[PDB]
Write a protein that binds this ligand. Structure first.
Ligand SMILES: CCCCCCCCCCCC
Ligand SMILES: CCCCCCCCCCCC
Ligand SMILES: CCCCCCCCCCCC
Ligand SMILES: CCCCCCCCCCCC
Ligand SMILES: CCCCCCCCCCCC
Ligand SMILES: CCCCCCCCCCCC
Ligand SMILES: CCCCCCCCCCCC
Ligand SMILES: CCCCCCCC
Ligand SMILES: CCCCCCCC
Ligand SMILES: CCCCCCCC
Ligand SMILES: CCCCCCCC
Ligand SMILES: CCCCCCCC
Ligand SMILES: CCCCCC
Ligand SMILES: CCCCCC
Ligand SMILES: CCCCCC
Ligand SMILES: CCCCCC
Ligand SMILES: CCCCCC
Length: 441
């Protein structure tokens, strides 16, 4: 029960089911309420065997994720050269995680400890409690405290406003549990809708210590084919900053924009969707300005009993696809829209252009083969505020992956990549490998 933070295997399986019309479920605001996954599963309409295979995997995964005790591990030769997608940015070359889990009807507790080797992202200590939260449920709302990662929007490679490519921040978070449409007769048109609010404290944020990220996101689906999102973030507070309830208003540094996802299955019967996101650095009342852009197209197919996932996605984190040295920059918050050098927005940082494609096959067996190509111009102004991509570079890379159960429930995750670069700080070739061991108590 409770929150379900960024998992990549889960998301792709849910997205497959959703875009094929077998379930109806928003996947553009993480973490997801499990109670909302459960509801969509109870009104699931499969018609192929491939679809029953994927379906059965959903609860199996949530059992894995929320097992009483869970040991996780990651090791690698080096940092990947290209930026990584949803659920795929590791903060160190070598990691080891121990988590105690417990949840019920009205509670979710995830006590997570991590120890690290060969830091990529800076920290106070090689020990940390990232991902660690406790949550309680009341009146269909989940209230959470901890270091919970989020994902805001329909993109697979990044969120332009609140992503994953950075250490999760300590704070409060609130959400609907079940996300049904409003009962009120004159609001029933809105459809399934969801809010997320969060107040967080930035870590080691030099230029203005203890800076807060306060934010809000709203989504709704008026028709099964269209989801619409809105989200806003303000960088606020800190040492030498106004921190009054008064100064805290909306009328700091702001980011704000919209996203959408349009499913084609309900009309053309194609298990294909397209999506977009537009976040701006300034706000013209109702619309944003100084805009970063993101768009993509995704498909989801059955083979025999196997499943195939693919997406093609383009990002532009310049200002209006031309102007540089303003995206993820600020004049008060001078370290920019980054924690410990790593972007709170898109994995690239600001002023970046990115096209990426990914295909993956998933066996009945639940082996998962993947292939990923990417082209990326990054940090053209060699901005120090971005430690993810310190230098102006053009990246042309390929990344292969394999996921599979090795022994009973012990799962192994490998990766292998090559990156053509002009001035990277990481080996042109490398390989990583992760492990998951769930235990009962
Ligand atoms: C003390 C240094 C951190 C511990 C690193 C352990 C990494 C092993 C992961 C194995 C996965 C195959
Ligand atoms: C000492 C740390 C080195 C860890 C490198 C392990 C990478 C193995 C993955 C192989 C996949 C093809
Ligand atoms: C068996 C009941 C255990 C409930 C523990 C939950 C306490 C953590 C809540 C923190 C949310 C702000
Ligand atoms: C039923 C279809 C099975 C064929 C799958 C072969 C293609 C996977 C290639 C993986 C390369 C990383
Ligand atoms: C079972 C489908 C054929 C397997 C193709 C092997 C290629 C090795 C890719 C390894 C990626 C980590
Ligand atoms: C029946 C389950 C056994 C599967 C074992 C697969 C081992 C893959 C290891 C490859 C590491 C590079
Ligand atoms: C300095 C560049 C050397 C990179 C060595 C790591 C690559 C290991 C991947 C292949 C495993 C068989
Ligand atoms: C057996 C239940 C343990 C719950 C721990 C909660 C910590 C606040
Ligand atoms: C079902 C009653 C619980 C209300 C708790 C309110 C938390 C601020
Ligand atoms: C059964 C209702 C539990 C409410 C918990 C609220 C704690 C803040
Ligand atoms: C169960 C509460 C976890 C809080 C961890 C945050 C400390 C930085
Ligand atoms: C059932 C009425 C809910 C009120 C919230 C309306 C969502 C925009
Ligand atoms: C550099 C070490 C490579 C290990 C591959 C199994
Ligand atoms: C009853 C709806 C609550 C929304 C909290 C912002
Ligand atoms: C309460 C959600 C706020 C989102 C506004 C864009
Ligand atoms: C028969 C399918 C071939 C797939 C090549 C990647
Ligand atoms: C991504 C592999 C091709 C790189 C050479 C331009």
């Amino acid at each position: 029960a409770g929150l379900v933070v960024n998992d990549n295997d889960l998301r792709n399986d849910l997205a497959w089911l959703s875009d094929r019309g077998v379930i109806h479920l928003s996947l553009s605001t993480w973490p997801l309420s499990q109670e909302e996954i459960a509801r969509a599963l109870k009104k699931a309409k499969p018609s192929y065997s491939s679809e029953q295979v994927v379906l059965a995997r959903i609860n199996q995964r949530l059992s894995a994720l929320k097992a009483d005790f869970r040991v996780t591990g990651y090791t690698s030769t080096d940092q990947p050269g290209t930026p990584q997608g949803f659920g795929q940015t590791q903060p160190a070359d070598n990691s080891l995680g121990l988590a105690f889990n417990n949840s019920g009807e009205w509670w979710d507790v995830h006590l997570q400890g991590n120890v690290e080797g060969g830091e990529r992202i800076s920290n106070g200590s090689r020990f940390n409690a990232n991902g660690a939260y406790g949550a309680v449920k009341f009146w269909n709302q989940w209230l959470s405290f901890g270091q919970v990662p989020q994902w805001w929007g329909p993109g697979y490679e990044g969120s332009l406003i609140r992503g994953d490519a950075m250490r999760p921040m300590t704070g409060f978070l609130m959400q609907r549990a079940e996300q049904a449409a409003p009962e009120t007769w004159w609001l029933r048109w809105v459809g399934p809708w969801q809010y997320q609010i969060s107040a967080s404290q930035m870590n080691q944020y030099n230029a203005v210590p203890h800076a807060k990220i306060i934010g809000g996101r709203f989504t709704f689906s008026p028709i099964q084919s269209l989801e619409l999102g809105a989200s806003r973030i303000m960088q606020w507070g800190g040492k030498g900053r106004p921190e009054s309830l008064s100064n805290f208003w909306d009328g700091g540094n702001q980011l704000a924009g919209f996203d959408f996802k349009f499913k084609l299955e309900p009309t053309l019967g194609w298990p294909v969707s397209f999506y977009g996101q537009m976040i701006g650095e300034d706000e013209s009342g109702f619309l944003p300005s100084a805009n970063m852009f993101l768009g993509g197209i995704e498909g989801h197919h059955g083979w025999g009993k196997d499943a195939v996932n693919w997406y093609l996605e383009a990002h532009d984190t310049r200002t209006n696809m031309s102007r540089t040295n303003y995206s993820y920059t600020h004049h008060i918050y001078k370290d920019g829209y980054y924690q410990q050098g790593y972007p709170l927005g898109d994995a690239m940082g600001g002023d970046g252009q990115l096209v990426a494609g990914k295909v993956e096959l998933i066996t009945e067996d639940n082996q998962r083969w993947s292939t990923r190509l990417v082209y990326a111009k990054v940090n053209p102004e060699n901005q120090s505020i971005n430690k993810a991509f310190p230098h102006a570079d053009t990246l042309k890379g390929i990344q292969l992956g394999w996921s599979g159960d090795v022994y009973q429930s012990v799962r192994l995750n490998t990766s292998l990549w090559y990156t053509n670069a002009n001035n990277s700080d990481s080996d042109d070739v490398g390989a990583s490998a992760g492990i998951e061991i769930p235990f009962s108590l």
